[PDB]
Symmetry: C3
Subunit: 265 residues, 3 copies
């Protein structure tokens, strides 16, 4: 039994599997609508740290069992938060923030597959993923202001995805929105009732490409998030390309192409 198989068995709310390059993290609490609580949050951190270490993981796929991806926040968990003081609340929030950050920075391509409702922190995960595909019934909602709250921890990622113009509407109205609108706003990349068929071509493309190059694409895009294009941007982009090209991995990618053979990454 592998470390993944052991973790899969010990996690309460998640499954996790690893086969042929592709790791999966699966929301496996359908009986409670995959609703988030402190345990789900923590289990997701653990699975992420597990697969980041793992050399056999080229891609991380996030999915969920049941009809709904997450109905968002567990009511019992919400009652507990309500009784918390500032500092306990801050610690909770910081763990949810650590979850989003580690996903967003995961040094490997991530694909999220979203069926039905994806409410609450789930939208953050989707916005933290590099590729997201939802089914036609997929449902979204930024509801916090209905409860005197705000979606603070997910807002940086959600705003990056959908933009300020749309965030200022949807975060203030707390209206529901559908799959097609999601697609337009670029919350998702594709709509397909067969989420497995829809993911295949992305998985195929991603397993073919340079692990190092994909990790560097991600740090590079990270460095550009601020929108600045000045001398330092120019110097840094030029240094990145020059470095990878002389790297072993850069060198192997080029040689494989010249020699018309498959790269051994």
């Amino acid at each position: 039994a592998t470390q993944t198989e052991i973790l899969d068995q010990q996690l309460h709310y998640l499954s996790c599997t690893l086969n042929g390059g592709v790791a999966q993290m699966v929301l496996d609490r359908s009986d409670k609508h995959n609703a988030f609580d402190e345990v789900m949050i923590s289990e997701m951190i653990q699975v992420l740290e597990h697969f980041k270490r793992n050399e056999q993981c080229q891609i991380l796929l996030l999915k969920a069992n049941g009809k709904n991806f997450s109905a968002g926040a567990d009511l019992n968990w919400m009652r507990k938060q309500a009784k918390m003081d500032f500092e306990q609340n801050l610690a909770d929030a910081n763990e949810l923030a650590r979850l989003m950050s580690m996903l967003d920075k995961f040094p490997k391509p991530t694909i999220t597959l979203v069926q039905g409702a994806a409410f609450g922190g789930a939208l953050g995960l989707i916005c933290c993923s590099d590729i997201a595909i939802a089914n036609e019934r997929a449902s979204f909602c930024l509801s916090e202001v209905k409860l005197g709250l705000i979606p603070a921890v997910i807002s940086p990622y959600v705003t990056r995805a959908m933009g300020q113009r749309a965030a200022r509407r949807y975060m203030l109205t707390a209206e529901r929105f559908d799959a097609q609108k999601a697609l337009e706003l670029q919350i998702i990349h594709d709509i397909n009732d067969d989420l497995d068929a829809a993911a295949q071509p992305f998985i195929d493309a991603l397993l073919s490409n340079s692990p190092q190059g994909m990790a560097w694409v991600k740090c590079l895009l990270s460095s550009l998030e601020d929108g600045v294009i000045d001398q330092n941007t120019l110097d840094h982009t030029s240094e990145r390309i020059a470095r990878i090209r002389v790297s072993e991995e850069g060198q192997e990618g080029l040689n494989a192409f010249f020699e018309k053979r498959s790269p051994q990454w």
Copy 2:
């Protein structure tokens, strides 16, 4: 007679009314195409400062009488600007800049309803609003470069809304664009010939939600405009959610939901 009714009577170019949570600022100079001059600018500042203070204002709705929202800049006003020296021009611009800033930062949801032409500073207002709905004949144009000018004061807001890729086209061509293109670029959120029916569902959603939470959504989105997502972003978002949750308002929103009752905000 209320302070609003008195202001409504004294303003030359605007109307203003207040009923049932909803304040309205209405461009009421149809005879001159709601064209902006120094007086319009100043009256709009006054109405904004009036409703920001007002505790009975949960939402601010901006609308205009006549067939056109604003044909943009008053010709007589333009002749005056032409004769101005640098410093007089700077003062004008700073007042227009103070108008946009105060609207953009207004701590309450704003909805703009745009019929026909919305030229000149009107586009800035629309880009400063949280929700904008236009009719099918709505017309837009960034014309300044046709006159050896630039739309400098509105550009930050307009750029935020439509993005750099589209700003660099439309600000350089000065071409007219239509409602549908507006919608695609996200200058507007909805298209409907019945602007009143179109606003209703947004008004209903907005009056239901936490005034404090909506104000905090707006400051938070403001803080994220730069695109940076670093340690401080993480610390600040975590501090915001923790704070509101323990607030009276946060607490009341949560309790109302647990108790399955309406929040008394």
Copy 3:
């Protein structure tokens, strides 16, 4: 024979012409699919520096001969890069970076017309142009990670155009995308099999407008790229409008309009 006619004759890979306000830079290496190498890069720099100086150039149009805009990077050039050490690579990259920067900052409206494939650095040029029109067969691809590389030098411009949400997909998958998707992502502004007819209305609009005002629109949009809207943004936008208005050019644009005559720019 003009300086342009002389340059046109001496360039190996480009043509260049100048007529009636409109300068053209033309990729003229169809036999090798307009593929980029060090010489193409350098020739493009020279043509840009040539037309920036030129007072008879109001607009710069970029186009290409043959069926394909650029198949991207020349294989012979790639073999050379592979053998380069860090510092030689850095110099290459810095020249490609200097090319994109000078185009992006060119103080005059640029229009790019893209037929078929536009792979590699070509996408950067397109993303550096103010207006881009492609035909229905136009093809795009960010392929670098297939070779253990990254599109580092073009990424700032490409990211500005299409956004982070889409960059993180396409830069990681290295998938091909088509004209329509390009249009949606705003990589292009229009789709038309008749690229010459499609450019005409933009050329007409651009030759009519203030050269100074268009140059200032561009610096101003540049200054706003970071997304910050603070006191200094406000002060700087107000100073720009006040300055141009009192300028000779500002003054002439206004007077021509008041006098219902054509501006003599």
